Design a protein around this ligand. Structure first.
Ligand SMILES: NS(=O)(=O)c1ccc(NC(=O)N2CC(=O)N3CCc4ccccc4[C@@H]3C2)cc1
Ligand SMILES: [Zn+2]
Length: 258
């Protein structure tokens, strides 16, 4: 009886196995744009993905992950609110059953159709597993998706999804350039939070871009053909794999922009 996104094992149940679910710095949150304050001290944000080396794409039963070779300093996030260098390890998405829902963060209570999470770990902790035990261990770059024009740089991901339909399937996925998933502007909001899935560790500096990317209805419809189940098990479509907004508690959301 494992955690998931069903009626019986969804986000409102997670606190029984993961009591930190009711903690002081849980994610995602609603971003109240009028209450976020411009912080002129944030340093410029630096996304350096030219040398990123993708390895594989995996259906883990909760989302699909594009994983990167993080054995050297190639693809790094620095600057913004961050002290030091954070290395890209994987990206994944959260999405809805309908275009009106799917994002984890919300903006003035608006839900986007999906949200991209580019996950990075702080190199001062040596490995990912050590980093997630630290309050500044991870930096996750979050990018909203809206439905409209296709995102050409997403299509290579869309086209491999038929080969990883069910939980536990993986496929080779080399030479994918995650710069093709970024919007034009790097304006962002930032706050201290958590993983949005169990174990819900409070180790993340969240950096949420203000500008959504546009993807086509056909691209997101292909996300919604994935399965939560394993092969040979009753089919359950992988949709609504998002945690709703959590209490902000004693936190301030900072804006990089006026
Ligand atoms: N929704 S979110 O952005 O808040 C979020 C939620 C969970 C994770 N975890 C992650 O990307 N994992 C978990 C992990 O232990 N390893 C173990 C080490 C290892 C090694 C290679 C590739 C991936 C991994 C994964 C990475 C991160 C972010
Ligand atoms: Zn995520």
């Amino acid at each position: 009886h494992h955690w998931g996104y069903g009626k019986h094992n969804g986000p409102e149940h997670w606190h029984k196995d993961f009591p930190i679910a009711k903690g002081e710095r849980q994610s995602p949150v609603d971003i109240d744009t009028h209450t976020a304050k411009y912080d002129p001290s944030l340093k410029p944000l630096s996304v350096s993905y030219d040398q990123a080396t993708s390895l594989r794409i995996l259906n883990n039963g909760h989302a699909f992950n594009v994983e990167f070779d993080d054995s050297q300093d190639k693809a790094v996030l620095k600057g913004g609110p961050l002290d030091g260098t954070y290395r890209l390890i994987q990206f994944h998405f959260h999405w809805g059953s309908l275009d009106g829902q799917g994002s984890e963060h919300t903006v003035d209570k608006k839900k986007y159709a999906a949200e991209l999470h580019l996950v990075h770990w702080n190199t001062k902790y040596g490995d990912f597993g050590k980093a997630v035990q630290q309050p500044d261990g991870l930096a996750v770059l979050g990018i909203f998706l809206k439905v409209g024009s296709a995102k050409p740089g997403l299509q290579k991901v869309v086209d491999v999804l038929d080969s990883i339909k069910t939980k536990g399937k993986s496929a080779d996925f080399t030479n994918f350039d995650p710069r093709g998933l970024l919007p034009e502007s790097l304006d962002y909001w930032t706050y201290p939070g958590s993983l949005t899935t169990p174990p819900l560790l409070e180790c993340v500096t969240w950096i949420v871009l203000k500008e959504p990317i546009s993807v086509s209805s056909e691209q997101v419809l292909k996300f919604r053909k994935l399965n939560f189940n394993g092969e040979g098990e009753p089919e359950e479509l992988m949709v609504d794999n998002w945690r709703p907004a959590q209490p902000l508690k004693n936190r301030q959301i900072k804006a990089s922009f006026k």
